[PDB]
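Please predict the structure of the following assembly.
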Amino acid sequence: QDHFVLKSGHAMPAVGLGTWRAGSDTAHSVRTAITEAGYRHVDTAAEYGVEKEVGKGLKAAMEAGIDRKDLFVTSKIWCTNLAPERVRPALENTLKDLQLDYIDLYHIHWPFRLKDGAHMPPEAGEVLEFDMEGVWKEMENLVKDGLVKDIGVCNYTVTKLNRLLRSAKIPPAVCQMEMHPGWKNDKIFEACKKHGIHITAYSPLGSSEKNLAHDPVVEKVANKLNKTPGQVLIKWALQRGTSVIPKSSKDERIKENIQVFGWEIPEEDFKVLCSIKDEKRVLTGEELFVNKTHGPYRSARDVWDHEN
Ligand SMILES: NC(=O)C1=CN([C@@H]2O[C@H](COP(=O)(O)OP(=O)(O)OC[C@H]3O[C@@H](n4cnc5c(N)ncnc54)[C@H](OP(=O)(O)O)[C@@H]3O)[C@@H](O)[C@H]2O)C=CC1
């Protein structure tokens, strides 16, 4: 499939362009991706600090004749804005940056409220209680008011998800999570599956930090299939049945990364890829949420409700 259909009925393209740490070429990258490479999904977030430039990319893409209706734009509401009263202004800011009337998916970026002026790593009192029910309620009002087509969560746990599901009038459309060989998070996937929640794999290449493009297991499959490591990694996600948001700021790799249709990874190789031990986790949240001295989160384990 080149798309998924969310519970709302809206289609989401299976492959999107990640824009975190996209840098100076951000706007060019978004435009190339959409016009030249045929991407119809861009993943971004306020905290990446690139939405303005992404809005410029999307603008030139729509000036090139791509209908708004055919684009899927994701953004994320940052922790600092995870208070009911701040949900709407954050979105409105995001929409101004992105030069859009609406976005297709708005995620809870991380399920943790941060104090204004919070530091990395957080100081005492800077990590606050997330009023998930109250914040989600305003996330729902975004959809009611046509500003967001679907709402989602990133970086959840099963615990947090069950909590959200007991309250949500509109369940999250999409759960976006770090997934890649060496960090499958089948635990969250199976909980999303059970609840009919679609899953996006972020950092599908291992991000830069645990990039898997040079991993011998990935290289081995890639050589046999005559695909680039990145292609194999992106295909692996699709074969798991997640959407997938590979990031590159290089036009060649932008194009490379969506040449993931009309072939498959043999199940034997898919299985080798899956058998890479889950322990290659890039985003623990430690530097965002963990104060070991004062808490409330003393370790990554606390961040992830000890689920992984
Ligand atoms: N909800 C959330 O908390 C998060 C969401 N995400 C989203 O997911 C996206 C993707 O994850 P991210 O961690 O950015 O990175 P990816 O897993 O997509 O990998 C990006 C890294 O791999 C390189 N790369 C890109 N294409 C190839 C290629 N085919 N072959 C070899 N190397 C390649 C990139 O370099 P180069 O640019 O030079 O090509 C960069 O170093 C993010 O951009 C963001 O949109 C990411 C982190 C957290």
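DSSP finds twelve helices and twelve strands in the chain. The first strand starts at residue 3 and ends at 5.
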